[PDB]
Amino acid sequence: HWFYGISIGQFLSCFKRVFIKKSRETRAARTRVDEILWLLYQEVYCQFSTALDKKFKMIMAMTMFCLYKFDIESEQYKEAVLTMIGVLSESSDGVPKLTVDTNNDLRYLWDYVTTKSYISALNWFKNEFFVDEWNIADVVANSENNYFTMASERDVDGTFKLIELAKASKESLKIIPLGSIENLNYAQEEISKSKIEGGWILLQNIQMSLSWVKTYLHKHVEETKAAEEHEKFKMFMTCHLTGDKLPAPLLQRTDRFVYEDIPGILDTVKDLWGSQFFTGKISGVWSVYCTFLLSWFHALITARTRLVPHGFSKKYYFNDCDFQFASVYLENVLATNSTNNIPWAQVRDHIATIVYGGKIDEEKDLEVVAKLCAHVFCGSDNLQIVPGVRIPQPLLQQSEEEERARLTAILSNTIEPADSLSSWLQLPRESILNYERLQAKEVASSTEQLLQEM
Amino acid sequence: KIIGSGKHHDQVSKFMKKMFGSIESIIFLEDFITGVRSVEGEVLNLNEKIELKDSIQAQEWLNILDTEIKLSVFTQFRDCLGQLKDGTDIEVVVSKYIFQAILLSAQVMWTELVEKCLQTNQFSKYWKEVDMKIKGLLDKLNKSSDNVKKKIEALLVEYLHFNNVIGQLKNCSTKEEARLLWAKVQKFYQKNDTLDDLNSVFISQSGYLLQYKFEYIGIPERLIYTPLLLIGFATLTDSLHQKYGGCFFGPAGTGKTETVKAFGQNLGRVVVVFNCDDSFDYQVLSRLLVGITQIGAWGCFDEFNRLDEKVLSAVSANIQQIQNGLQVGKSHITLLEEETPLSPHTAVFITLNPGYNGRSELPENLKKSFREFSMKSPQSGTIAEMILQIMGFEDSKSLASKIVHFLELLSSKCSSMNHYHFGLRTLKGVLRNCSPLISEFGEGEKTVVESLKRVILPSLGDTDELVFKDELSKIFDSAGTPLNSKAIVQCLKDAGQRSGFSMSEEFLKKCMQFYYMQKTQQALILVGKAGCGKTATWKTVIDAMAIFDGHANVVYVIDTKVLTKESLYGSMLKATLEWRDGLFTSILRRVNDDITGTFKNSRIWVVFDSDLDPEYVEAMNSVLDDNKILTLPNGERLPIPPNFRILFETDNLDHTTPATITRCGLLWFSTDVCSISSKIDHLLNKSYEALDNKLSMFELDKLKDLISDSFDMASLTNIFTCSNDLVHILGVRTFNKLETAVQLAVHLISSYRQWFQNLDDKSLKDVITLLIKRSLLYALAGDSTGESQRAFIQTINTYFGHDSQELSDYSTIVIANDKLSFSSFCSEIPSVSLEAHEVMRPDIVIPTIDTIKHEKIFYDLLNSKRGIILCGPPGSGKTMIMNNALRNSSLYDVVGINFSKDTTTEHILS
Ligand SMILES: Nc1ncnc2c1ncn2[C@@H]1O[C@H](COP(=O)(O)OP(=O)(O)OP(=O)(O)O)[C@@H](O)[C@H]1O
Ligand SMILES: Nc1ncnc2c1ncn2[C@@H]1O[C@H](COP(=O)(O)OP(=O)(O)O)[C@@H](O)[C@H]1O
């Protein structure tokens, strides 16, 4: 992948830290060489896994655990774990050479894998490093660089996380979105004055201005080695993993990491519902109720988007533009029509086909969106979107503020069950198990292939 | 040029098409402007004539005319709407007003009436009224002129949309469902209590309102209204309401750009279409973008996904600038390094085609300002019913349902094949071929049956024909019969038996299918393995039609793959700026330009007699389509006359695109059109007629009688079946070796005509039989190992009669001028000695039995005027045997070309 580039200098700095990091006396590995090797593995995983996404985090953890335990442990361990990864991958099958009372943790791993709990089996290797994965706080504080790239997918943006960090980190995060030539000139003035003033600056969505970055930002960051001699400022970049390929030298000069934090369905509902009234009310009570239902539907559709090929046969990024268009349509239909609910039948067919079904190009996914809309919008005085919540229709006095408070209360009362992806969404649990088995198979195949090379 | 044309004022009309997009000319008066006329041909008369003094600038009077045409269109609309509201017949009002005005008046009246009809829920009366209006328009279409016919067809399209919507509303069970359906349908309204007349009429869809700008649109190609089209309109109006642009993406040929253009026409706008990936310069596009922003027109980027990366980035930046200015509401946006006003009525649409990587999406900077939508091919049944309703078909719903069911049934039951395509395109082809058949038989079910049998049946294989017949019988209750049978069948029999061809049932069937297919189709494809009879079939049909109608025929047989694209279509000297005709365009110009020759009363045929590939046919896809024009990359755009017909003679379609197969009438030869003992007879007659010019009468009659009765198919059928048992190097089926056998036999018989007059009948019969055996052996098993040749010799001596002179491995007729007997001998084994200095010359050969036999057969094949192919391992002696056979003779001179991994065709000529 174009984002996971690694250089010799970064590796050597990471190894330098192995000695220059007297945190806590680790496990007694006899000779000092073994302890240094273990610390090297720990530091490499702790630093260089931030620049990777979840799947490659798992792949790195498993591969480096295999590399370490193919030397520390015995053959009864090596062939056991080799056949174990063969079992996890769906390409091979068999029983490992389980030596009783000799490889205990391998027996816990066997208990995990037989119970078909793939996620815990893959997190076992991460747990065996006994190291806490660096959050962005650790990366921004520890790394002695002024430039970071915050990559992710198109579904989640970590701008709020960076805002929360920098508000708690010494001053004034300053968001500078790109776009038209006005945005470009504003950004260049802002950076030229912020390298002197020292405030942390952020560059949302670098990708759309790729041609600009190839010409202005590239040579700038490559030449401004005196920025470290300027005031202590930090320049951030937000990109997309699926986006266009950033230039290699620009990416190499800056630090990189991948923001992997998918909020829960209830968390997304709460965030959207909170943000909707921040801009102020537009119409009466029914507009508020329809906006609440639209927030629920948007959260459900976005959550189902991530699963593939279970749920949606592809990945359709439903951004906030779809929500805005659906909200505008809801306001229009509730303004032209009357207070009664009669036009629900046309609220669905427009939302399920025109605003949220426009991007869809397969009939199965269109059917999925249509049935989701039918479930969410068709309601008669009591709506059960997920099996844990019931939404009563507005009152008779039509007190809008009380209705908004009641909707907030009914959001706060409920909590998300651990099996929400099977209960809150309509797809079955066996579908989730198949998806997890597929991802575990991919991880095991990739790590075995890497093991063949190394 | 316009600036310098400020005195004549008549040179602007050339550029009116470019600067207005819809009107092609300005109709002048002696000193006034008396109107305009569009590309389709239609006089829009301005209410107020424009005076043109000599001192006035072109800019000023063009500016006044720009508003005058819109005001005239509104005046026509207002006059027409009132007349229609009065209750005037649509037929009496068609002849008065332009298509756009009558269209908008109709749409507004229909919306007004159906609103109250929906209020009262009485749809039957208005449905019947609209049906009567449609029938009146249909019968007036037959009695329409060349200009009014397009207007009537477009009004039929819109009126059938009206009737479809009214019927769907009638079938709705509940008022809620009826209003749901009414919301999606694009309704039209006008404000009776407003000023600024040009903003009176607007359009409401899904609750969103769009103003109707009264720009003249002419009489455009109206798209058939389908429930997938109105969803496209709803998506476009949803995007336009929030000021977002409009993006379509989907498979090519789904009419994305045509849907955008139809949306513009319904709103009264002409959409400026920027065509991409046509070596389209960026500066001209930037100028067009500035014009779009300043005027307020709608700009559609056709095939936007194919552009150079730098050009794509620049144009995306410009589009983002325009869209940001529209969304914010700011005026005077900054582009082209200039601040220019931005009219708020501007809009940008994009159509993205699927690339090599599969799906194509917008650049990142545009994804935040464009609402993408996925286009699909329409449902077959809906537009099938719509087209059948376009024609005067009764029970059009039932006919369309039956046709669609039959097509799906065929696709499910018939054996899979590469050219078997029963999608929507096949349906549209069936309906287009059904259209001209209405003159012969009426608009019943049997017309559809005949069109299906004339389109689908020829393209089907042998085993699927029975499926076609029985499913046609069990789906369509009535099975028709074809007319014009006796005359053309007799003419085909005459034109075939005149050329020696055998009128078997299969050959006559294929000829009849080709004749019926060419009756309506313009581009023909004939597919079948080598030797089926494609050339024989189409030549026989050409001769039959020449004898029948009396029209002369001009045939241009061109091999496409021999000639490069520059030679076939036309080459341009980019370094000297001259365009060369090429081959196809030269013979097209010789048709259009010339009139002295018999070119109006004659049928022109261009037979591409070679394998076809997508690269060659994509340069003439416009010829294949309904445009019927050859679009050269640079030069005049040639119109093909009705007589000009393109045929494709090939043997496979493993590389031809589905579009070409669907557009072109396909005739598939699943089997040989004649049996073995009909091709043999045809070749025998073709050789007898050649010998006839250099022989006496009685001798020739006796000789041909002996040749005919000497062999019979009873004995030869076993030989032809046994020849397949032999292993053949460079294998060719015996149906193609028959030519070599017959030609060699006849030539060998003819070569000894001097020694036949004084020859006894028994010895003469033995000579003829032996020579026939020799020819049969060297044609059927002539490409065998050499021991299998002896096995075939034993087979030959077995299956023929036991009394005729047996053929041995070396039996040759040697004739001496001093004796009269045939004196057949074999195995000479000559001897020769040579000096030391002659040990290596390029012409020294040691004569052995193999060398003599090979030389004799090679020379006999050469004298038969047929090409030879010597196939053997390296060093076997093919070149040596040729050069020895031709060095002895003083009639042939050898030219040795040595082919390599790539020898271009001009190497042979050089
Ligand atoms: N009706 C017929 N009766 C007898 N012989 C026939 C008949 N039709 C065709 N033939 C024989 O079959 C031959 C087929 O020639 P033709 O050029 O039509 O073949 P084709 O299948 O189109 O192949 P090609 O690809 O070589 O052009 C004719 O030359 C003739 O010898
Ligand atoms: N009967 C023969 N007398 C003399 N030379 C022969 C005879 N048969 C085969 N050869 C040799 O076989 C070789 C075949 O050469 P050539 O004709 O160039 O091969 P090809 O026909 O495959 O191109 C000749 O060089 C010749 O010397």
Ligand SMILES: [Mg+2]
């Ligand atoms: Mg032919």
